[PDB]
Design a protein around this motif. Structure first.
Motif, PDB file in Angstrom:
ATOM      1  N   UNK A 164      48.370  39.228  36.943  1.00  0.00           N
ATOM      2  CA  UNK A 164      49.616  39.978  37.162  1.00  0.00           C
ATOM      3  C   UNK A 164      50.927  39.167  37.117  1.00  0.00           C
ATOM      4  N   UNK A 205      48.437  42.615  28.670  1.00  0.00           N
ATOM      5  CA  UNK A 205      47.946  43.074  29.966  1.00  0.00           C
ATOM      6  C   UNK A 205      46.672  43.907  29.821  1.00  0.00           C
ATOM      7  N   UNK A 209      44.143  39.487  48.223  1.00  0.00           N
ATOM      8  CA  UNK A 209      44.870  39.714  46.982  1.00  0.00           C
ATOM      9  C   UNK A 209      46.310  40.145  47.282  1.00  0.00           C
ATOM     10  N   UNK A 235      42.491  40.552  37.979  1.00  0.00           N
ATOM     11  CA  UNK A 235      43.763  41.231  37.756  1.00  0.00           C
ATOM     12  C   UNK A 235      44.899  40.619  38.567  1.00  0.00           C
ATOM     13  N   UNK A 236      44.622  40.291  39.828  1.00  0.00           N
ATOM     14  CA  UNK A 236      45.663  39.758  40.698  1.00  0.00           C
ATOM     15  C   UNK A 236      46.148  38.388  40.219  1.00  0.00           C
ATOM     16  N   UNK A 288      44.291  45.919  42.551  1.00  0.00           N
ATOM     17  CA  UNK A 288      44.889  45.563  41.257  1.00  0.00           C
ATOM     18  C   UNK A 288      44.048  45.997  40.063  1.00  0.00           C
ATOM     19  N   UNK A 289      42.732  45.841  40.132  1.00  0.00           N
ATOM     20  CA  UNK A 289      41.880  46.233  39.002  1.00  0.00           C
ATOM     21  C   UNK A 289      42.007  47.730  38.664  1.00  0.00           C
ATOM     22  N   UNK A 324      44.826  49.545  39.437  1.00  0.00           N
ATOM     23  CA  UNK A 324      46.195  49.741  38.957  1.00  0.00           C
ATOM     24  C   UNK A 324      46.266  49.406  37.475  1.00  0.00           C
ATOM     25  N   UNK A 325      45.694  48.268  37.095  1.00  0.00           N
ATOM     26  CA  UNK A 325      45.783  47.847  35.700  1.00  0.00           C
ATOM     27  C   UNK A 325      44.916  48.697  34.775  1.00  0.00           C
TER      28      UNK A 325
END
Ligand SMILES: [Cl-]
Ligand SMILES: [Cl-]
Lengths: 948, 930
Positions: B509, B106, B66, B505-506, A96-97, A99-100
């Motif tokens: 989201x 975001x 995650x 981040x997870x 995720x880190x 992707x963002x």
């Protein structure tokens, strides 16, 4: 409704968000130009003979919110299965880190090629990490910054191998168990070159036919792991280079190509946390021995020194070789899949060697467990050794039944031959998934074993002599950023070194650095687009099919062509596909001797490269003394070669930025002598809604979706290069599935399918009126800039009211004659004003080509012009002897903070004059990370960059 | 079961705990080595008093990856239904511009910093906040606006409290219009109760003013959509020296004459409509505006314009109130909406909504329905089977508002299209063929509010609201502001008492999934099953962590948690017929919000002494508990103490309070030292709040309130705030039943990914890292308040006072000098004046901890140079920090130190340099950390 809604107060309009200049600003700019309306200017800029006489037939524009909602309903028609199909694509988990903060961060995806390396050190470092990762994993000494996809990478290996040989061999061996799309891509590349592709069994190949190279798949497409050492040794005693297409995740466990004795390794890095993307985009790797480093295709990061003696990176080019074998060893690639190589390298950084090996090990253990359970259910397994993929014999009556039951659970398996199915496991696979597979094959949910009881039988299922012992990713960079906070800060530090579109205008001529809008980008990371396997059954991809149908119709209407192929996955691939289609056309009429390709001498070097790759012989056509195309040299050569004439490659408007009103006649000429017309779409941002290539006589063109149609530049990527063709060429387009077709240009039938949604969104939000207005404003802004600078820099190649089109060419040659200032001096000095340079020394050596696009505000245009005017005055001070001609800001740019703050200051100018030469830099200052990097004439292929 | 056993055999998978923790196993063993301990467990055994050590594993679901946790929450979220809700009631669907969603909401560069304590490195979000204030000022027509408040209801309650404090009336009654939003009325009553304020809910049409009031609250437009001219009412209120507050929809103010022009004294409202997700209640920034004549008692924070050391412009963040925060992230989003749309864009959004509403009205009339609002903006009151109307609407995925029998409400919004309009007509008609054509109605369309209330004044005329309308311009403006600010994507921000840990981040989201972000807080229960599961799980887990029997997720700030907890204690004593119990014992070292919350609860504060070693004075506590035994309501404690100490006496302290009839409330400021190691309920607390934005990963938002849920024992459970619109509830603490519900997913994700083992290890490593820093720095700065075995807990207090004695260096000098090293300062001068309190958290790596220690050590040496006369005591880097690039490059350099010594005092600054945007800019009793 429609007429009701037209009566309501205006809603937020995407056109307004996309256009930099508002109505007020446009009126200001027109007034400086001396026109009452934009319509008046466009009527003078575009020759009536080619002016598109009506509105584009496209769906009316939607709001950002409305377009998203429509695309969402389309996307909802795709089905996200658990695809264990394999074949070179495997589901993976994008941290995720990453992707963002990379994939969804305009700071990483909006810049283009690192032409100006001093302001691109961040992404250059990530690419250097990619190369190190590839070198370590493959065990080979040299790795480039990435290639388009696995199949094209393999074809590049074929070309390199031909160039290295000195034998009478004209055959290239391809193992029959390579991925099938890889074989297709190689055949397609081999055909125009007359290379014999031998598809055969590596076990029994006799070497009785001379080969210059061989390609082996590791592990093979059906999952089998083989020891290739004896083949490699035999190939070497027959003087052939051996390339392994090797899964890089498997190389954490298996003895690597380098240690097996292979000469080249290629493969996809998709499995390193890159979305399936229904085909792409993914960065392929290419590695080889140090002895072949000068022949390395594509781009490669090298370590150099700046003016302060400190380390600095630069993106090197393939050195130009003169040799008798150039006609089959040519490459046309000037880009790297930068954004995706950054993503894959960061996957390695985040996981480390131990994390990566553990991912591979768990996949292998789950695969071994699957195999044990399948045997207990009386299926036969056909791989002696394997990594992640099983070949299961099921009984030819049962195979379609097994595939259908799997689908019943939302699972895709690979249909092999009748009586056989393939299964490839991946990073997403859990013990629950394993249970679903067992129950599908058992035909019931109760098993004659417990999953856990099988563990005792688990052991490494590839041989000891292929069990890797050598280490990889030992460098500090792969060990120190494993917490999310540390990776976040590492990414931020790298990103902060680079100037991207979130800082200032990057007015790159011929590159169209326009807005990559958030709403266009958002759907790329929807799983309904991002998580689909390219070889998933058609029943699960109805949304993509709709997307394709609509995009094809829309691009067809914009271009005027009857058919569109969305497959070619780079600008250079578009050119290549377009020439391939033309070649196939002449073949379809029994005219194998039409191989002459006419090309204007001002063409970008990828054009003749592409032509040579297509087995064509390039014949140069001369330019005017007024910088237009010379019809009489064209004719003289169109006659001389008249019965050998295959093609003319042309760019419209010209590479000189000219709307040549002679365009239809040039086309009418080529046709008269039997040739076809291909248009390079580089300058299509000057055309949309104003004229159509098919209408003026082009038979085929490519479009650069990453230029004209908003796919981001990715820090240097290929983007997408779909081709449009007329009806008579339709039969020859690349295949849309796995026949007069040229075959496959890209590994995947729709190339990098997932990023196509961006151009879909752009067209949906703009509409007919929006797309056309954007073109007109881009022409307005170029003319505005030309007008502001004309008294300081001569403007080259004007109209026609002496207007330009979408770009303006500044003549900097006077500055060298007067002040001994070089174009590179001006380019670096711009950094001190907070600007990335425009295109340097192409098409005219010693000049700059500026393309603002329609997305940049009047304020930003004025600042760039003021910077250039300030630089003119700096040059004047040199010319007039008011400052040391060798020691001045222009010669010493870019100026880093440290150089201004640390040590003794011995310059005849102040630190303030160096760092803050314009008022706006005192409100916001972009700091160049390094001083001028060590090391005029342009590369012959990658024309916008320096020769290597 | 058998799958679990098999899964454990496999090669290890990516573990979220490893990503969350800064120190890995190797780093941890290195730190333990410097401390003198072989294992983490040996350290923890000496750090936590054995009498309060939790003796078992937390009972929580085993950790998930995650990838797996996201997949689980996705299946929960899919149980929610995203309807087209035209319910209104203070929440209206809106379009968040994608550029704002991606690059602010975001973007960790925007959501990871905390309050702008250190203004020189927060100029970016300060400017966005200044923009918010200007926007509110222009729209309301009132001169002074703060940086935002929690929600509309609490802002109105703050207005009531302001009115009570400044009105010259001798009245004790506050008038609330019966057509204010129902939840606003509830929040007002809840705040009025402990203050003894009489709340009169009535009709403003017929209110006689013969009943004396000190203030009145009116809704504009009204909850049922009616637009009224309140001028005459306001004039009568002023005749009685009462202040009038309008709760005014800021979008409607683009068209309607604003509160300032109507004569109103205060305006409040929500800015949720300015592109902020519904969020099933929040978070949204409320606005509060008033006159200069009332300025001095206005609540919350306000951005002011000041000057820096170079004379250049610089921003700083300048009936009691306990609020120290602003809804910063959401105020930033609301102001950027204004910046992106401009005055014309906003007015057009409002105008379209109105036109659509008039069109709806004309169509409903053709269908023989009665329309009850003479004037309206976006909301209709429709008279009829209302149940069948509502049910028919639900059939098309639409919610209308059920009013009274035979009447329904419809509130239109920015998302509404003519197709939506067509849907509403067909519902009310009963068929798809209408007796009119949509286009045919346009002719009857006219502005449906009067000329007397038709706004003529302009707004958003400043350049900032006019120059960033292209997406490229806004992207760049956002990038430039962001670039000025130091957030967690730059370096550690080791603020004691704030727990600046990883906001993963997870975890972030799901906040922006439509199934959480796009649900109206008052949607029917049948549509919110996913949230119901979320709430149930979170309540069970937080209850297990704290040991409490029940959890309320409602309070929407840390300060709201304290307030709620004390209200529950107050209600308990009332339930026992003991209203005379209003004494609140509070240690003298407590944060200022504690006594402010107690006072808001009608309690009298009695301070309790710290002892000579900085622990609670047990003798003093015992004496005061005994003295006020007959009147003792509560003791407020933080554990471990505000001095960072695991006191072994905590259980004894709770026993003493109970013996004298008081209840024990625990402030959750330091819960990051407790999770898995001890439980508040277990040692004797009756209630606590948790800060989900500290201990449980909700981002600090550049200064936000986060969420402050409370846990209570069974005997207090009856008094919890209500979870829906006789019982013993205190009423409503937040405007929405579940406060800022959409951000609760962040803490759910953290707990799901960590598991019981991970949550506990996080606590242990937080304590390891604080102890490591204290051991590194102790030879340079005296470490105050070590616990038993000379260990600290999760933070350490560095004594900077010797630097003042030796070098005339102040704590602020060190705080600014840290900027030149690339660091945000720790907590300054609280709880001990002239000191710094450092809390690294478990999320920062050994490398980062060592750099911070090295910076502090280098600064110690700079002070020494002053002490020893090696550099001018006034002209040195400490006194002149922070150093801007321009100051080092432009003009004459006359300092006795070099520009290099100023800008590059550590080797890492030569690899990456963070530039302070401005030079130095030219202790509060409530907001103690400032
Ligand atoms: Cl349109
Ligand atoms: Cl666990």
């Amino acid at each position: 409704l429609t007429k009701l809604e037209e009566k309501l107060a205006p809603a937020d309009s995407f056109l307004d968000r996309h256009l930099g200049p508002g109505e007020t600003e446009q009126r200001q700019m027109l007034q400086t130009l001396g026109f009452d309306t934009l319509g008046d200017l466009i009527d003078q800029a575009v020759p009536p003979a080619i002016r598109f006489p009506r509105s584009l037939q496209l769906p009316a524009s939607q709001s950002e919110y409305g377009a998203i909602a429509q695309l969402k309903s389309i996307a909802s028609k795709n089905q996200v299965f658990r695809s264990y199909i394999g074949m070179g694509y495997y589901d993976t988990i994008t941290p995720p880190v990453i992707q963002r903060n990379i994939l969804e961060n305009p700071g990483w995806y909006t810049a283009y090629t690192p032409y100006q390396a001093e302001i691109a050190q961040g992404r250059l470092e990530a690419l250097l990490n990619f190369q190190t990762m590839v070198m370590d994993l493959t065990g080979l000494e040299i790795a480039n910054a990435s290639l388009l996809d696995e199949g094209t990478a393999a074809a590049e290996a074929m070309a390199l191998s031909y160039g290295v040989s000195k034998s009478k061999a004209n055959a290239f061996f391809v193992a029959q168990d390579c991925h099938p799309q890889t074989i297709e891509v190689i055949k397609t590349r081999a055909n125009p070159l007359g290379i014999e592709v031998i598809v055969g069994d590596h076990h029994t190949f006799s070497f009785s036919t001379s080969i210059f190279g061989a390609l082996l798949q590791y592990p093979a497409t059906d999952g089998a792991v083989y020891d290739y050492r004896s083949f490699i040794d035999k190939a070497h005693q027959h003087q052939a280079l051996v390339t392994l297409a090797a899964d890089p995740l498997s190389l954490t466990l298996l003895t690597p190509p380098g240690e097996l004795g292979a000469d080249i390794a290629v493969g996809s890095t998709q499995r390193f946390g890159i979305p399936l993307g229904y085909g792409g985009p993914h960065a392929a790797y290419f590695a080889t021995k140090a002895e072949y480093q000068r022949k390395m295709p594509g781009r490669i990061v090298g370590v150099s020194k700046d003016a302060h003696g400190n380390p600095a990176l630069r993106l090197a080019l393939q050195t130009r070789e003169q040799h008798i074998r150039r006609d089959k060893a040519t490459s046309n690639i000037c880009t790297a899949q930068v954004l995706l190589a950054v993503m894959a390298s960061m996957y390695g950084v985040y996981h480390g060697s131990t994390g990566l090996k553990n991912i591979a090990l768990r996949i292998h253990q789950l695969t071994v467990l699957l195999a044990i359970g399948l045997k207990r259910l009386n299926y036969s397994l056909n791989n002696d050794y394997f990594f992640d993929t099983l070949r299961v014999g099921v009984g030819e009556q049962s195979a379609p039944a097994i595939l259908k039951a799997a689908e019943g659970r939302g699972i895709n398996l690979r249909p092999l031959v009748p009586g056989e199915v393939g299964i490839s496991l991946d990073e997403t696979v859990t013990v629950q998934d394993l249970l679903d597979l067992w129950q599908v094959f058992a035909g019931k949910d109760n098993l004659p074993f417990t999953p856990e009881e099988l563990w005792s039988e688990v052991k490494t299922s590839f041989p000891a002599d292929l069990t890797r012992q050598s280490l990889y990713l030992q460098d500090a960079v792969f060990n120190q950023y494993h917490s999310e906070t540390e990776l976040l800060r590492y990414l931020h530090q790298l990103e902060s070194k680079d100037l991207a579109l979130n800082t200032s205008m990057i007015p790159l001529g011929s590159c169209t650095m326009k807005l990559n809008a958030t709403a266009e980008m958002m759907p790329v990371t929807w799983p309904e687009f991002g998580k689909i396997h390219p070889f998933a059954p058609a029943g699960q991809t109805e949304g993509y099919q709709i997307l394709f149908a609509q995009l094809e119709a829309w691009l067809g209407e914009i271009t005027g062509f009857d058919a569109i192929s969305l497959q070619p996955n780079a600008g250079s691939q578009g050119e290549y596909a377009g020439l391939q289609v033309i070649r196939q056309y002449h073949l379809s009429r029994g005219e194998e001797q039409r191989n002459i390709c006419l090309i204007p001498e001002s063409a970008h070097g990828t054009n003749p490269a592409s032509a040579v790759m297509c087995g064509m012989q390039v014949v140069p056509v001369k330019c005017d003394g007024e910088g237009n195309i010379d019809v009489e040299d064209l004719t003289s050569k169109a006659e001389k070669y008249g019965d050998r004439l295959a093609a003319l490659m042309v760019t419209y408007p010209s590479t000189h930025g000219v709307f040549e009103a002679t365009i239809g006649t040039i086309c009418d000429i080529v046709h008269r002598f039997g040739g076809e017309v291909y248009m390079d779409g580089a300058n299509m941002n000057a055309q949309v809604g104003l004229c159509r290539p098919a209408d003026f006589g082009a038979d085929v063109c490519h479009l650069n979706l990453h230029k004209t149609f908003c796919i981001p530049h990715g820090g240097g990527g290929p983007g997408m290069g779909p081709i449009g063709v007329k009806s008579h060429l339709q039969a020859f387009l690349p295949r849309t599935s796995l026949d007069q077709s040229i075959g496959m240009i890209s590994a995947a039938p729709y190339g990098s399918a997932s990023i196509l949604v961006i151009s879909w969104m752009y067209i949906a939000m703009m509409g007919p009126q929006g797309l056309t207005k954007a073109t007109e404003v881009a022409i307005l802004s170029a003319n505005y800039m030309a007008k502001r600078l004309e008294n300081y820099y001569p403007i080259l190649f004007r109209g026609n009211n002496e207007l330009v089109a979408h770009e303006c060419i500044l003549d900097l040659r006077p500055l060298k004659k007067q002040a001994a200032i070089e174009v590179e001096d001006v380019a670096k000095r711009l950094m001190d004003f907070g600007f990335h340079a425009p295109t340097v020394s192409w098409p005219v050596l010693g000049t700059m080509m500026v393309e603002p696009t329609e997305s940049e505000s009047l304020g930003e245009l004025d600042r760039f012009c003021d910077a250039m005017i300030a630089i003119y005055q700096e040059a004047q001070a040199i010319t007039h002897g008011e400052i040391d001609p060798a020691d001045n800001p222009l010669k010493n740019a870019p100026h880093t903070a440290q150089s201004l703050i640390c040590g003794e200051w011995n310059h005849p100018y102040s630190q303030e004059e160096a760092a803050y030469p314009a008022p706006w830099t005192k409100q916001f200052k972009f700091w160049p990370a390094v001083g001028r990097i060590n090391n005029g004439d342009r590369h012959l292929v990658c024309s916008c960059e320096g020769m290597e």
